[PDB]
Amino acid sequence: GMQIGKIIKVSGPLVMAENMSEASIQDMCLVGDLGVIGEIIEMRQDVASIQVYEETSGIGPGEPVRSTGEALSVELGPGIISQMFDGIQRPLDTFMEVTQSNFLGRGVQLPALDHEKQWWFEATIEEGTEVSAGDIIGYVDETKIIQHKIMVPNGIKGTVQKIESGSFTIDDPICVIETEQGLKELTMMQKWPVRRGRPIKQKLNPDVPMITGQRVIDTFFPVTKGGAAAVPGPFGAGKTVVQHQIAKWSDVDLVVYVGCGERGNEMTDVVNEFPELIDPNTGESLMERTVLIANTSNMPVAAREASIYTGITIAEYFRDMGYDVAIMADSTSRWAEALREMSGRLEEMPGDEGYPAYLGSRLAEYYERSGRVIALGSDQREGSITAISAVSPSGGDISEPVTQNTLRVVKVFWGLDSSLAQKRHFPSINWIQSYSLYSTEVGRYMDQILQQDWSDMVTEGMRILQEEEQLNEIVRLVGIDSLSDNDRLTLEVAKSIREDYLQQNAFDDVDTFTSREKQFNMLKVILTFGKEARKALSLGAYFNEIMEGTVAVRERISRSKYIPEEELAKISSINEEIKETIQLIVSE
Amino acid sequence: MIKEYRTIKEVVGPLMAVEKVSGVKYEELIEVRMQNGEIRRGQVLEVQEDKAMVQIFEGTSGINYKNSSVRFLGHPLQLGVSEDMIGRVFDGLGRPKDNGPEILPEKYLDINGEVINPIARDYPDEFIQTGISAIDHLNTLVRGQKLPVFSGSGLPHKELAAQIARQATVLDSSDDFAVVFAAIGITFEEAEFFMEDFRQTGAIDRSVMFMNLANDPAIERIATPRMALTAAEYLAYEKGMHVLVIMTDMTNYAEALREISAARREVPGRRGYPGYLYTNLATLFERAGRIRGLKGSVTQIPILTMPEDDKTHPIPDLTGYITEGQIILTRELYKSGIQPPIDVLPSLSRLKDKGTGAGKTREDHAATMNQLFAAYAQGKQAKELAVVLGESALSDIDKIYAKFAERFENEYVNQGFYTNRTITETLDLGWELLAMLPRTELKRIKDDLLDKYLP
Amino acid sequence: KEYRTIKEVVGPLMAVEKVSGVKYEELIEVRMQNGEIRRGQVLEVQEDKAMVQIFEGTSGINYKNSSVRFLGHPLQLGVSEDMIGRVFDGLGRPKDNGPEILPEKYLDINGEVINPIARDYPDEFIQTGISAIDHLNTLVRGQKLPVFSGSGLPHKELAAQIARQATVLDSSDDFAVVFAAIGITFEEAEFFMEDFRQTGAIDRSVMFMNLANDPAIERIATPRMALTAAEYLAYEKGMHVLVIMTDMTNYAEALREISAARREVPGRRGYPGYLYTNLATLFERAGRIRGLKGSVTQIPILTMPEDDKTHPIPDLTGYITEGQIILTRELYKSGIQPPIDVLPSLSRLKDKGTGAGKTREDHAATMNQLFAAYAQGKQAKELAVVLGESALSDIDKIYAKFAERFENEYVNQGFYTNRTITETLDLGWELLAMLPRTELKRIKDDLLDKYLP
Numbered sequence A: 001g002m003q004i005g006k007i008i009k010v011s012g013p014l015v016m017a018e019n020m021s022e023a024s025i026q027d028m029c030l031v032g033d034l035g036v037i038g039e040i041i042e043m044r045q046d047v048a049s050i051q052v053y054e055e056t057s058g059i060g061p062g063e064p065v066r067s068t069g070e071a072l073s074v075e076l077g078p079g080i081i082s083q084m085f086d087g088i089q090r091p092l093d094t095f096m097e098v099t100q101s102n103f104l105g106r107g108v109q110l111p112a113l114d115h116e117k118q119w120w121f122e123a124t125i126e127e128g129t130e131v132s133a134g135d136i137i138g139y140v141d142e143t144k145i146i147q148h149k150i151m152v153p154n155g156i157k158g159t160v161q162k163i164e165s166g167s168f169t170i171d172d173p174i175c176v177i178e179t180e181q182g183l184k185e186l187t188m189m190q191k192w193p194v195r196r197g198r199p200i201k202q203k204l205n206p207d208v209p210m211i212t213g214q215r216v217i218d219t220f221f222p223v224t225k226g227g228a229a230a231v232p233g234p235f236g237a238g239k240t241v242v243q244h245q246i247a248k249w250s251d252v253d254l255v256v257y258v259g260c261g262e263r264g265n266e267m268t269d270v271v272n273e274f275p276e277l278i279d280p281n282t283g284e285s286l287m288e289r290t291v292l293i294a295n296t297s298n299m300p301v302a303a304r305e306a307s308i309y310t311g312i313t314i315a316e317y318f319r320d321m322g323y324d325v326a327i328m329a330d331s332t333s334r335w336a337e338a339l340r341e342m343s344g345r346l347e348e349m350p351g352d353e354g355y356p357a358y359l360g361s362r363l364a365e366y367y368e369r370s371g372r373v374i375a376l377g378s379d380q381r382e383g384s385i386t387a388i389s390a391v392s393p394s395g396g397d398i399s400e401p402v403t404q405n406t407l408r409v410v411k412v413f414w415g416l417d418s419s420l421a422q423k424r425h426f427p428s429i430n431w432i433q434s435y436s437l438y439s440t441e442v443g444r445y446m447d448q449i450l451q452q453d454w455s456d457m458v459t460e461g462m463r464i465l466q467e468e469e470q471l472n473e474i475v476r477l478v479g480i481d482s483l484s485d486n487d488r489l490t491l492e493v494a495k496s497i498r499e500d501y502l503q504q505n506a507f508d509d510v511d512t513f514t515s516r517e518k519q520f521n522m523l524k525v526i527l528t529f530g531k532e533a534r535k536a537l538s539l540g541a542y543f544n545e546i547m548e549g550t551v552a553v554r555e556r557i558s559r560s561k562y563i564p565e566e567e568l569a570k571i572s573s574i575n576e577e578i579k580e581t582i583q584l585i586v587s588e
Numbered sequence B: 001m002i003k004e005y006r007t008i009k010e011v012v013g014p015l016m017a018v019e020k021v022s023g024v025k026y027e028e029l030i031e032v033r034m035q036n037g038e039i040r041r042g043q044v045l046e047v048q049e050d051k052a053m054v055q056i057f058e059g060t061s062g063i064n065y066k067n068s069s070v071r072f073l074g075h076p077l078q079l080g081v082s083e084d085m086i087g088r089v090f091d092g093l094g095r096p097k098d099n100g101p102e103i104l105p106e107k108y109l110d111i112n113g114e115v116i117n118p119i120a121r122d123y124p125d126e127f128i129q130t131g132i133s134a135i136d137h138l139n140t141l142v143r144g145q146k147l148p149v150f151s152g153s154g155l156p157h158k159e160l161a162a163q164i165a166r167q168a169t170v171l172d173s174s175d176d177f178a179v180v181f182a183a184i185g186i187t188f189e190e191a192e193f194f195m196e197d198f199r200q201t202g203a204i205d206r207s208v209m210f211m212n213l214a215n216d217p218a219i220e221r222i223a224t225p226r227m228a229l230t231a232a233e234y235l236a237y238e239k240g241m242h243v244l245v246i247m248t249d250m251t252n253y254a255e256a257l258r259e260i261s262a263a264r265r266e267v268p269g270r271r272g273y274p275g276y277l278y279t280n281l282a283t284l285f286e287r288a289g290r291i292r293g294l295k296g297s298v299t300q301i302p303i304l305t306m307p308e309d310d311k312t313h314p315i316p317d318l319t320g321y322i323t324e325g326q327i328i329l330t331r332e333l334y335k336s337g338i339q340p341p342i343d344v345l346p347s348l349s350r351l352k353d354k355g356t357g358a359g360k361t362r363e364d365h366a367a368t369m370n371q372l373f374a375a376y377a378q379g380k381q382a383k384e385l386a387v388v389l390g391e392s393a394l395s396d397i398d399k400i401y402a403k404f405a406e407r408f409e410n411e412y413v414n415q416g417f418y419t420n421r422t423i424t425e426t427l428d429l430g431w432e433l434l435a436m437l438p439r440t441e442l443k444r445i446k447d448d449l450l451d452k453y454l455p
Numbered sequence C: 001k002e003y004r005t006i007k008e009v010v011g012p013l014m015a016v017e018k019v020s021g022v023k024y025e026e027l028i029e030v031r032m033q034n035g036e037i038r039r040g041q042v043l044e045v046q047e048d049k050a051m052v053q054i055f056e057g058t059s060g061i062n063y064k065n066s067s068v069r070f071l072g073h074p075l076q077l078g079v080s081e082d083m084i085g086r087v088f089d090g091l092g093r094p095k096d097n098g099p100e101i102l103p104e105k106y107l108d109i110n111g112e113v114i115n116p117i118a119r120d121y122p123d124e125f126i127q128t129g130i131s132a133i134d135h136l137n138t139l140v141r142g143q144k145l146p147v148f149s150g151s152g153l154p155h156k157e158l159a160a161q162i163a164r165q166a167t168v169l170d171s172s173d174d175f176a177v178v179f180a181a182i183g184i185t186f187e188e189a190e191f192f193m194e195d196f197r198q199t200g201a202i203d204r205s206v207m208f209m210n211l212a213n214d215p216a217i218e219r220i221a222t223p224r225m226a227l228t229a230a231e232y233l234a235y236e237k238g239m240h241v242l243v244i245m246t247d248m249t250n251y252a253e254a255l256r257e258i259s260a261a262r263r264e265v266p267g268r269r270g271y272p273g274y275l276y277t278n279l280a281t282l283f284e285r286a287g288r289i290r291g292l293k294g295s296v297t298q299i300p301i302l303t304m305p306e307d308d309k310t311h312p313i314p315d316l317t318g319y320i321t322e323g324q325i326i327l328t329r330e331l332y333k334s335g336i337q338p339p340i341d342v343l344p345s346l347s348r349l350k351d352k353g354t355g356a357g358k359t360r361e362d363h364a365a366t367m368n369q370l371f372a373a374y375a376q377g378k379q380a381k382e383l384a385v386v387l388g389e390s391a392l393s394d395i396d397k398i399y400a401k402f403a404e405r406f407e408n409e410y411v412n413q414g415f416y417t418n419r420t421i422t423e424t425l426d427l428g429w430e431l432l433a434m435l436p437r438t439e440l441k442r443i444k445d446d447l448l449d450k451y452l453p
C-alpha cells in the first residue's frame, strides 16, 4: 500500500530518507523504528530532508520512514481550554499518565483532546439552513464564562439536514450537511494546519486599548486589542514577569501562553498559580481562560518553531468565535535561533548574523496573523488577537536581526533597560526609548470613556520625564545647586512619576494591578502637586520650604499605589489636601 | 510555444529544478500544476541543456514533485494594461482583489519594460509644490524625478508620503496626478492608512494599487513594483497622464531578492545581498521621467526603512547611488515633535537647479537655500558644543546660530502633516529666519538680493 | 564485529567506513595498535559511514592498524550509592586508587527532560553559610544559581567553601554534593582534593575531575556524568543534591574545538550558534519532581572573559539560570572574602525559601533595607572620593560608613568561616543599627522594636 521510505542519514534533528517519491513538502512523518514525529522540509528527487520534533538518539540509516500525508496540524474543539500542550500539541498531563513517567519520552502518539469525554452540545441552528465556513451551528459551555462555539469548518458549504442537541464526544457526528459532493457529517472538532493562517473576511484597525493593569504600559505605551507589542531586554530585566502580568490581568476573553525555548519552572509556575487566582466577579480561576504551550530550552529544538504556530492557530480559532485573545511568545529569540540551527544543518546560505535569509518574512507573517478581524460567517462577528512577544538579544543589544525585524512590523516597543533592573526599578521599561504608535488614538478613546482630559495628563507627565533627562545633563554640567527652584521642582515631580507611578511591584497583592480609574486618580494627584507647587513658587514660595511642609501629603502620594480599589476616594481626596497645605505654606 | 513537463527534479524552498526540457527560455512564465489541483505561477531563472531553474511565487509547500507538472507558457510575466485599471485594487501579481469585474486588457506588456533612450528623454524641470518647506525650498521635487524617502521603523514615513500625494501640484498644470501605489510586504495597518487617506481625498478614484502585504508570499514582492511601474509607464506615455508612483517598503523588496539569491546559493555581496543589487534596483528607479514629444510623465517616490537607522547599509547606500536625491527622516527630530521629521543636512535633491529660480519659483530660491543650509549646519554644531560643554562655552555669535537652528527646526521644518505652504510663504519664512543673523554672516547671498529681500 | 575501516582522523574526530546498523550517538570503542582502548560517540551517521568524536583524542592512533567497535547503546554511567566518597576522572573512571564501582544500573548520561507538569517548583532554604548569598541572594532547593567570576578571582575558594558548608536545616543526613571539575589546573585540583578530604566533605560527595592537562573532549562528558549521578541520588535515592561545576568557560572551549574540527561556521565571538541550547541541556536538569523527596540544585561557575558580562558564555548562562552571583576585582583588591558584589547579583527564587518556618520572619525586610542602604552608601562613597568629604551631607556620611562596614564586616566573612542564618540576620540588624530609625522605611515598626536594641 502506502510508500515506505528509508533513512539514509541522521545528524541531530536532521534526518534524510530515500524512497519518499510520493510524499509532499511539509508532510508529517513517522521517522525510524520508533516513529518519532518529523516534517518534510525539502526534497531532491526521492530523498526527503526531514526535521524531527523529538530526540533522534538511537536512530540510524536503514530504518523506515512513513509519511502521514498531512501537514503539521492542531485539533480544535472542546477540551482545549485549561490544558498544557507541548510544541506539537501533545497533552503533557496525559503524556505523564499514559507513559507512567515523570520524564519526556518519544515515539508515543497522543491525541491532543479528550475524545472520550462527554460534552453537552446545544444546537442553535434551525434545520434547512444554508451554511458556510464560520457559521455557528451550536455551542458547548466549556467553562461557565466561555462558550465554545461550534463553527462550520472552512471548505464546507451546504444545507443543514439533521441537527440535534445532546451529549456527545468530540468524535460523534452532531450535524449533517447536504453538499454537492453528498451528505457530510460534522463533529465538534476540526483540524487545521498550523503554518497556514486561518481565513477571515477582513482586518479592522485595532483601536480599543487593552487594560493590562500595568501603569507604565496603560498610561504611556498602550497596546490595543488586536495590536502587537515587542518587549526586548537583557537577561533578568523582566520580560517574563511582564508577560505573566498581562496574562493574569488583561481584559481579554482568552490567553494563549507559549513558552518557547525557556525555563521549565516558569511553565510549572503558571499551572500552579493560575488555578488559585480566582476572578471575584465570576468565581472562575485564570486557568479557566488559559491555554499553555510549553517547549522548554532543553526540549527538541525544532519544536520551538512548532510551539509558535500551534499557539497562534489556537488563538485564531477562538478569535473566529468572536473572542478577544492575547498570545504571549516567550521568547521569539529562541524560535529564531532554532531557525538558525536548522539552517546551518541544511547548509543554507546565511542572512544577517547567521540567521536564514527568510527570518524577516517569517517574523512578519507571524505578526500579520494577529489583529482585529471580521470573522467568516453570516453574522460577521468581530474578534481579535493581541500579540505580546519577548525578545532576548545577546548582551541586551537591540541592534540585532530579531529585534530589528520585529520593530518593522509591530507598533508598540517596551524596551527593558539593564540599569533600571539593577536599580530595582520594575518594570524596567526605558520611558525615553519605548514608544506606542497607538498612544494618540488611545488618548481619544480614554478621554471619551473617562469623560476626563486624560490625554493631556499623559502628555504633561511625559514632558516632565523628558525635562528630567535634560536637567540631569545640566546637573552633569554644573551640579544640582546651580539649578533654579522650578528646575528642582521638575526633578521632584519626575521623581514622583518614576517612584510613585512607573515603579510597580508585580509581586505585591495590591500593587500588582491598577484599574483604569485608579491610574487616573494616581496621576492626577501626582501632577496636581506639580501644578500647585509652581503656583506657590511664582507667589514667592520657596522650594525647600514647600518640601518641608509637604512631607505627610507627599507620603500619601507615594502610598496611593497601595490604596484598595473600593477606597479610591482616599486617593482623590489628596488633591485638596495638596491645595490646602501649599496655600498655608505661602501664607506662612 | 507552450510546453508541459512532468519532470520536476528538486523542490527546495522557493526554487524548483525541472529536467529533460527543451524550448524553455530565460525569464519565461511558468505554471506549476500541482498533484492536488492547485496552480502556482513562476518564472524561469536559468536554463541550460535540458534543465531549467524556476522560482515559484507562492512557495512550494504541499508540492509532490513526482505527480506535479510544469507548464511553460511561452512568454514572460506580463501585465494586461487598460485605462479601466484606474480606481481598482490588485494584488502583487496584478490580479484584482477588490471583487470588481476582471479587466479586459488593451494589450499585454512584459513587466520588465524597456530603457528610455537617453536621447529621447526630456530633462525633468517642472517644479512640484509639495507644500512642505523642507522639500520645496531645500530639496526641490520636480515632475519626472525619482526622489525617495529614507526612514526607519517607527517613523512617520507613511504620513509624509500621504501628505505629498495629497498636496503635490504643478503650478501651470491643472490635471491631477494619477497615483500608482505599490505596497511591498507592508502590514495591514500601513496599507489601510494609505487606503483611508486615498478614499477621504477622492484620490482612490484616480489611483491604481498593487497590494503585496506581509501575509502575502515574499517572492511575489519581486514582481510587485514591476507591475506598478509597467502600469505607470502605460498611463503616462500611452495615455498622457502625469503619474505619481509611491512604492513602500523597498527594504522588503531587497530582502526578497536576498532570499532568492540565498536559495540559489549565489556569491553573496555586502551583508548577503546579491552583487547585482545596484543593477536590479536601477531597473526600477530609472523607469521615471519624461519623453520628448509625449505629454505625460512618471515621478517616483520610493520609501525605504534604513536597517538600524544606518545610511551606509546596502539598501539605502545603493538606492542613494541611483535616485536623484533622498529625503531622510530621523528619530531625534521625531522625538522632538518635528512633523515631518526631515533632517535636511543629509537630504538632497539633484534636480533642483533647473526647476527653481525666476519664472519657476523666485529669483532668491537658490541663494537662500544655500545660506539656510550653511546656517543650520553651523547652528547644529553650536548646539552640539553646548550640550557637550555647556551654554557658557559657546561664543556670542554661535549662540545666535544655536538659536537659529532651534527656530529652523521648530518653525520652518516643523509645519505639520496637514499644512500646505505656498513656495512664496516658504521663501518669506526663510528670510525671517535669516534676519536672525547679522548681514555680515550671509556670504552665500549677493548684495542685491540682501538689499531687496532682507528685513 | 570489529571494523578495520577507519578512513580519516581530524582532531578529535574520526571517520569510519563500510559500517552497518550504526545509530546516532551510539557509543564506540577504538582498539589501538598499542592495545589501549579509547571510547567515543557517533556524531553523524550516513549510508555506510559514521563520524565519531574520541574523548581522549586521536593522537598516537594509527588508524590503518586500529579497529573500531560499535557497542549498540549510548554512553552511560554505571551509577551506585557507593559512588559517594569516590573521586573519578572526566570520563567516570576511578581516580582515587579505590575499587571499581559495581553499578546498580547504567543510565544514558544525556538524561531526559523533566515533564513540566511533573515538576515541583523550587522551595525551601539551602544554607550556604555565606551571608551575602543566604541573606540577599538566597539559594533555594532545585534552583540553578551560578557564580560569574574572572581569572585571578577566588571562585576556587568560594566553590570549596559552599561544598563544605551547604546544608538543609529541614533534614538530616540526606544532603550530597556532586562536584565536577572542568579543565582546571593541577594546583586547583590539588586544592579541591585536599579541602574535601581534610574536612570530610568527601564522605558526602562524588567528584568528577577533568584537568587542563587532560584531553579536552572529555569535558563534554564530564558535566553530563556529574548530573546523571546527581539525578540518580536525588530522584532514585531521595537525596538533596547540590551540583557544583567549575569552570564552565572551559566547557565552552571544548564545544568550540569540536565545532572547529567539524568546520562549522562560528557564531558570536567564535562560539557555536547552539551554545545556548547545549548549556540548557545541562542547567535545566536542576529541579524538583512531584511525589519525590529529593532535589537537584546547581551552581555553575564560570569566568567572564575580559570581565565582560556580555560575552556569550556569561550572557547565555544568565539567560538560562535563575539569578547570578558576581565576584569583582574591586572587592577582591580590598580583601573582601568572598568578593561578592550584591548590586549586580540576584536570586530570582529566593522568596520561596525565606520567612517564618524556613529562615526567620525578619529575613525579607532586612534584605531590602540593607540592599537599599548599601546602594545609597556606595553612591555616597562615589561622591566623597571623587568630590571630597565635605561635599557629602551628614546623613550621606552615615551611609558611606555603613557601606564600608557592610563590605568589611558583613560581606567579608572569610573563606573558612561558616555563618548560620541566625548569625547572618543578627549581624544584619547590627549594621542597620548604624542608621537612624527615620531611615528604616522598608522595615515594619514592630519588627524594628523586636529586633533592634
Ligand SMILES: Nc1ncnc2c1ncn2[C@@H]1O[C@H](COP(=O)(O)OP(=O)(O)NP(=O)(O)O)[C@@H](O)[C@H]1O
Pocket (backbone or CB within 6 Å): A233, A234, A235, A236, A237, A238, A239, A240, A241, A242, A262, A392, A426, A427, A504, A505, A506, A507, C318, C319, C320, C347, C348, C349
Ligand atoms: N514587575 C516586576 N516587579 C518586581 N520584580 C520584578 C519585576 N520584573 C522583574 N522583576 C525581578 O527581576 C527578576 C527577573 O525577572 P524575569 O521576568 O524573569 O526577567 P527575564 O527578562 O524574563 N529574564 P530571562 O528569561 O533570563 O531573559 C525577577 O525574578 C524579579 O526579582
Ligand SMILES: [Mg+2]
Pocket (backbone or CB within 6 Å): A239, A240, A241, A262
Ligand atoms: Mg524570562
